[PDB]
């Protein structure tokens, strides 16, 4: 139960592609309560990206099957309960990360960059929660997703240069939230253009920024058409 040892395990698990172990290790590192290094932050993020990403991807498949089995009612129902199994896992993962975010990572964030990184992450996991939430629950959770991205956006505008990959990554995911979750193409497109625009002003100086700038453009192409 040593930080150095938890981090090396996380790295071994990553090599082994055992992301559940990778997350649990980094969870334990977080729960010792000290501010994560950049390295440890990235490991944690990668790990849970993979853990949650597996379930999101599975959910889309089973959800597509449920839809395509309308009419074949018993088979649809089998897909429906299996979707619910996957949803339960998804809620658990999201709740785990959001609790870490609330108790440890957000309170321990001593610099603007890392505060933004973690608020973005909170918006992310709230987003994922909202996608498999019900009725009045969903409304509240979408609002929490929006508040976290907005806090992140506001700190990043005031305290990071427009090129920073975390600031750009935030713009990408926030504008996706607007398109996909709130059904606001105008707001999504505006946010993506403003961020691309503000970054180009200082591309002259510096990478991974370009890759995110490209993703912004790609989303814009998708949404307009």
């Amino acid at each position: 139960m040593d930080k150095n040892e938890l981090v090396q395990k996380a790295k071994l698990a990553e090599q082994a592609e055992r992301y559940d172990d990778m997350a649990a290790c980094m969870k334990s590192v977080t729960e010792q309560g000290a501010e994560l290094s950049n390295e440890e932050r990235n490991l944690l993020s990668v790990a849970y990206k993979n853990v949650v990403g597996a379930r999101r991807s599975s959910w889309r498949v089973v959800s597509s099957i449920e839809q395509k089995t309308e009419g074949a009612e018993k088979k649809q129902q089998m897909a429906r309960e299996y979707r619910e199994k996957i949803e339960t896992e998804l809620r658990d993962i999201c709740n785990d990360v959001l609790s870490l975010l609330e108790k440890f990572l957000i309170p321990n964030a001593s610099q603007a960059e890392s505060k933004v990184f973690y608020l973005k992450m909170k918006g992310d996991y709230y987003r994922y929660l909202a996608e498999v939430a019900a009725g009045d629950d969903k409304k509240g959770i979408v609002d929490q997703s929006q508040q976290a991205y907005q806090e992140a956006f506001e700190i990043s505008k005031k305290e990071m240069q427009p090129t920073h990959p975390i600031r750009l990554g935030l713009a990408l995911n926030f504008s996706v939230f607007y398109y996909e979750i709130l059904n606001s193409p105008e707001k999504a497109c505006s946010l993506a253009k403003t961020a691309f625009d503000e970054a180009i002003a200082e591309l002259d100086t510096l990478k991974d920024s370009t890759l995110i700038m490209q993703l912004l453009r790609d989303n814009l192409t998708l949404w307009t058409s």
Partner: peptide, 6 residues
């Protein structure tokens, strides 16, 4: 083992 919008 999948990665997502993050």
């Amino acid at each position: 083992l999948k990665n997502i919008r993050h």
